[PDB]
Design a protein around this ligand. Structure first.
Ligand SMILES: [Cl-]
Ligand SMILES: [Cl-]
Ligand SMILES: [Cl-]
Ligand SMILES: [Cl-]
Lengths: 97, 97, 97
């Protein structure tokens, strides 16, 4: 019995050491949670800025699109009237001679 | 007393089992921390590339802006001359006849 | 001995309260794991959308590049035609007089 007790006390001391080492994790789980929140903030930040960038790419693209469609057709008109002027000038120079 | 001991031994066996299961978190908390760091690497990277993309949507926009302003102008003055040449060909043809 | 036992029982009750307190962390470790996976999902999404935005900025840029090169070309030739038309309108007007 005195030996039962000695043994029993030993088992107990070994255990309270083990619980010593498990209380380290209270400190650690805590900082992890703090970080998951920080990482989460950062993600949301990034999700908005992709949204702002997305919005601008699709705008910049659409406005270029339509504007140049319209330049190409000044230049279209313009090249026609230039031909047709050069016709004229050929025929005026004929008539003088 | 002998009953006091038996009880005590039971409480102890139940405990060392409890502690077996809690030992399992030493792994989990360690995996999780490694991951918060990996997730944090990834974020910072995305953060940079949103920066590079932002920078371009701002540069691309500015260079388009100024180029087309200049072009629409060169077309404006080109179209002016042309109309005015069309005037001078009308009036020349009117003098020949 | 009876005092050894009383002590031993005390150490035990204190301990099981420890283990009460420490089973607190299980729900906290596994709400954190849930979250690391969520944050990890969200990263992967952001990563792709930066990819889609990147792809387009490079596209928008490349298409503008080449188009203006080609317009600036047509205008390079159109402006020649125009000089050379003003030449002949000068010379036509000098022949009429
Ligand atoms: Cl972006
Ligand atoms: Cl954790
Ligand atoms: Cl995270
Ligand atoms: Cl991200």
């Amino acid at each position: 019995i005195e030996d039962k007790i000695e043994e029993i006390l030993s088992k107990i001391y070994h255990i309270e050491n083990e619980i010593a080492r498990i209380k380290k994790l209270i400190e650690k789980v805590d900082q992890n949670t703090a970080d998951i929140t920080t990482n989460t903030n950062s993600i949301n930040q990034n999700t908005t800025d992709i949204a702002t960038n997305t919005t601008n790419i699709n705008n910049l693209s659409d406005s270029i699109t339509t504007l140049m469609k319209q330049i190409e057709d000044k230049i279209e008109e313009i090249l026609s009237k230039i031909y047709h002027i050069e016709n004229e000038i050929a025929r005026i120079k004929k008539l003088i001679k």
